[PDB]
Symmetry: D2
Subunit: 404 residues, 4 copies
């Protein structure tokens, strides 16, 4: 049975995804290096139970809704904005992704980036390439003994810190919440302190309304003269022209930016920033999280998630679905996804009692529009298959399945 369950993988996900699939028993895998055109996409997805895609493939309403057999969708990536998360929820297909798999990559990028900035290496290299030699030591520093101020002490600030400390930098941080320090990191309660003390400032924050432009003319002029600004969290967090200002003012020595409010949609599309005129700014194409090793983690994680769901019904971490997860105990497990009618649960429970079946466990979780419930029962294939078909006749029923 498991090997009649087809995974469609596009955009060159990492091999380990494929390894995990196969070791879980899912050996039916149509895999693609690039993205597919419209007519091939619909061809390959017409009968896929699962799909793993990444940034570029668009699962629009129409695409999802022609996908006849689609059980869940796996964004092997961070973003899910290429998927109709809500079209998908109406057909009862959850969407998973990998939000915290890039951590070491971003941390590393930053460390690498600051080392070079503190030295004026970006600037020296740009001149070098056009035949201008600029050997000077004025302005330049080792990072050892410098103060690094991390704004955003989440999954990434944490690891950034640990590295910064590995290199003997002094580590201070600001987060709108009280965070337990690792090694000898130090929490600064006010942001204007952190800015003042810090030789380099790094942002590691979510894209919310506390963060839109959290760094303006104001905040930046608060920063130490000669300092460095690093942004590789979100494109909206920093007011580019402000920093452009502060960079010609030479109030800042330089900067690195891996994200922008606006980004080229493909790589053939042009890039535009005013920062593009500063040799002392590292400008990178949102590759903060782009490494093979990151790809391997996203591989392990989003396959892992698809498989768990397929095998156990778990929606822990699904982005568009009520979150359920029940531990394994002996018996059969079934599951019902449905509109939020009242008395679906009354309907469900009546079914098992009629058949004289004990419900070992169940977990119903509701969102505004939908409901998902996983029920364990002690019974045989015959019995479970009838409950199944009965469960499929409940009013509201979007989808239901015997998982084992």
């Amino acid at each position: 049975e498991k090997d009649k369950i087809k995974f469609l993988l596009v955009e060159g996900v990492h091999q380990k995804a494929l390894e995990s699939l196969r070791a879980a028993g899912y050996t039916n895998i149509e895999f693609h290096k690039g993205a597919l055109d419209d007519e091939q996409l619909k061809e390959s997805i017409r009968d896929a139970h699962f799909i793993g895609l990444r940034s570029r493939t668009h699962l629009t309403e129409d695409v999802i809704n022609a996908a006849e057999k689609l059980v869940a969708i796996g964004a092997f990536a961070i973003g899910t904005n290429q998927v109709d998360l809500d079209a998908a929820a109406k057909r009862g297909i959850p969407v998973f992704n990998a939000p915290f798999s890039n951590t070491r990559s971003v941390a590393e990028l930053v460390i690498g980036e600051l080392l070079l900035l503190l030295r004026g290496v970006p600037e020296a290299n740009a001149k070098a390439h056009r035949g201008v030699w600029n050997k000077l030591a004025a302005g330049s520093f080792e990072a050892r003994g410098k103060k690094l101020g991390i704004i955003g002490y989440g999954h990434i600030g944490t690891q950034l810190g640990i590295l910064a400390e590995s290199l003997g930098m002094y580590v201070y941080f600001y987060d709108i919440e009280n965070k337990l320090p690792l090694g000898n990191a130090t929490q600064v309660q006010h942001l204007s302190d952190l800015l003042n003390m810090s030789d380099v400032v790094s942002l590691h924050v979510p894209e919310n309304p506390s963060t839109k432009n959290m760094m303006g003319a104001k905040e930046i002029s608060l920063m130490k003269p000669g300092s460095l600004l690093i942004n590789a969290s979100r494109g909206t967090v920093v007011d580019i022209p402000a920093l452009a200002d502060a960079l010609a003012s030479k109030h800042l020595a330089g900067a690195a930016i891996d994200v922008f409010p606006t980004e080229p949609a493909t790589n053939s599309d042009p890039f535009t920033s005013p920062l593009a005129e500063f040799d002392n700014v590292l400008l990178t194409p949102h590759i903060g999280g782009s490494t093979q090793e990151a790809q391997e983690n996203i591989g392990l994680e989003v396959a892992g998630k698809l498989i768990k769901y397929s095998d156990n019904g778990s929606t822990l971490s699904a982005v568009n679905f009520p979150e359920v997860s029940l531990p394994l105990h002996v018996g059969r497990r079934l599951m019902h996804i449905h509109e939020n009618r009242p008395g679906v649960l009354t309907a469900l429970n009546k079914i098992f009692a009629e058949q004289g079946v004990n419900i070992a466990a169940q977990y119903l979780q509701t969102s505004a529009q939908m409901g998902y419930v996983v029920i364990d029962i002690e019974a045989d294939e015959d019995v479970a298959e009838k409950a199944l078909q009965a469960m499929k006749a409940i009013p509201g029923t979007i989808r239901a399945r015997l998982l084992y």
Copy 2:
């Protein structure tokens, strides 16, 4: 203290402030401080009456200039290189030269870490493309440093510090050296360079400039490096065959390089730079700034002020680059020194002068090179006797210079 005040220290070229702090602490307070270089003209003027000089790599102390200063005792290269100073001519006049050969250790190790971090990410190519309107975001062939193998070639002061910083970052560290060296942390000596080249994700060079290292990284070797690997050189301009490096990068056998030193380099920051490596967005080129930081300058300042101060106080030429190295521990009595050409009978005039004043020599350190000879002598005696002996010493044929240091 009133006798210190007489010794002109001239520091040009903007040496670190802690150099002056170190003079002052040692009593030497008369100092002509210049932030920049001086022309032919105000050189010879500020120097004329100058006991000690401090230059970096732009002041040119050539023969004529060295002949011009009527009172120069030592020279302090507050940098590594000494090629800007005619070593064989301060020697001729009995002026030892000093420098700071290893005051740049962290700075170079730090720089290499940053470079390899960004090169494994295809960041330099990304930044160049980005700054000209090209976006190119992809994950293929970009990698993290952690878990990667670093191949350090030349495991001396810098290799070693580089290695330490590298394993702190998660890298497995290997090295090759022509001598057998004791590893720190989990570094590993590799017996063949071809072994080390075949394995490394990154190879970084910290060897010295000499026949063995001249073009030691040539075609054959680059060819032995791992496909998709990285070449880094912040050692010497003559270690890597650059045309070869260029041909490897063009055929994508190497995926990047960072080079800080070149066969030939620009003499000032107004002199243009060229290299066949300029055509590559995936190569960091930096203008010999491996050891160019303020921490490094601070280190050089203390090192060399100390050497100059020590020479002045106790006559040590330990570490001097063009001069016989003598030093003797302070040890009760009066101390003299005597720099001479190796004339027959100099030593023999030296002890008769003391014999002939019934003066006991508690200590004597004599060292020579080709025609030069430096000897420092520690004596139990009066001052008038110490001053008298000095006069006698100064008249010995072959005597370049001699001084009663205390």
Copy 3:
């Protein structure tokens, strides 16, 4: 908050204060704190109107005591062990029991380091020699721990932590586990237990108790051990064949050992302890104090208080050692819980009611052990509807306890 004042916490055997700060930090204030153990008249007396109780290892909660505790909602064993508690008995009554399985971690790793350092150094013997008046200065046989190899048998909470500290000190760290573990730091998993016994200078046991571990370190395993090596068992009393170790100690195949646990241990600090290990000055014997520290007692106070708090506030039996495990995140509404013998028709009545009273179910999590079942039900509605429902819930034939939690 006046609601809470009703709910009596009975703490015996003197648990750490941090337990009381959580308790009071959560509006929970009727606390009957005791430092010591209680006798039966003291216990029934002081438990009869207890809503919760925290005890330790000496308090014996039997069926006759439990079937007396009239208001007993849950039981916290402020400890690792639960053998002093009658789990089936409290399960029969719908009383979760909780504990702190992994709260002693650092306290055990810290002990083993101290011990291995002094053992390698032959300190226990020199100490006992000194106190008896004998001076034994030697260097034959003593070692620093840096660069020696630690074999950890059981690579879990304590093992992992043990290896981290050991690496801090420069030891080489190897482990053998029955399952495949991700090694921390530079830790190395050894696949065959015999190579590990073969290479290791010190071997420290950190495994559970069970047939797979029982006497798992016997005469065979002891001889696989490196000459002049050291054994340390602070896991469980059944894992080492003490008389085998005693023989290997007598024969000097081993240099020493540290045993904190024993097949038979005194019931109280008043009962004598005997061991054929008592004869050997080069063995540390410790009265099962592996996890006995104040920091550990404070880990415990926090973990176990938090849990009893969480259960009283939100139903969570996540972690119970004798009860179905249920947990639901919070959001908008009110929340019921319901404990019942699993009887025909319970879930049917539950849902019949909700539709009698017109209540829409937001979330529901039911789990069961054998005849026992526990369901926690979030519903959206106002307090009259709620408590209308819960009164019907207690009427369902089978119900053991139902509470409108919030």
Copy 4:
């Protein structure tokens, strides 16, 4: 190089032998233990180099009849078992190993504080008697605790690093300002250190500044319920006061490895008022007694004898003027002599006359004696006549041509 005889008595580490073998010196009379007076006299009577430990006594009488002997090697730190004077008179330098066990002392301290903070020594002593005493009250983890180090030199410095890798916070007191390593904080007043520390350890030298610097007062200023560890010197702690403070329970325990008076050997009785305290570790001065240190000493002191014989370095000799000369083309000769006028004048005259250029020379004196190394550019024959002539300067204790 085979004609040179080394006598190593008392089981110096095998790295000493491995090194002599490397440097091409193979004639070795090795002895696991100490020689009694006749054997010693017979093995040494032709030895060039003796390497001993702390039990051997090279007295004048033995040294003096020691015919072929050129340098002495204490594979140890003490040189009080060696008559340094008798040895100089005869121009025999004495080498030893000043600091070869810093880690060993730091380790002992870490293990001791960790157990002592757990009451493990008492607990263990009780368990050896039948008494079980399981308790958490008063037992403490090391991490998060204040360790106060008194004396921040080789060993203090090191100990604070370990302590830090354990999670302790490290404070220190030193009579001078020092650069703290890691998170170490220098503490300007002894009393302030004493009050704050959960565990105090000592690493000062033996001198008046140091005698009983920890007395009734200082102990009473230690935090109630803290620990004192001394592996420094026997003269640093007022022991009776410590006793008192363990008796009154102001201190929860101590560890003492050094004592005002120590048995001379393992066979002599050891006594002490602390012996009655199960919560006190007592150790027979083994803070440095480990194989790693014995090996470190092995390379070091073998290193120094090899160096003296190959090139004449007397750097670190404890009884001799220190002279050292880098090496250069030519021959090298050596003169040791009584410090008195014109030796150097006749030395130098010898080379003047045979018309031989002196490439360098280094002489250094004491009050009573003088040593000088000479690099000359000449064939072997001329160096020989020179030797013979230098051997004759009145004043000459000894002269040798090294290469």
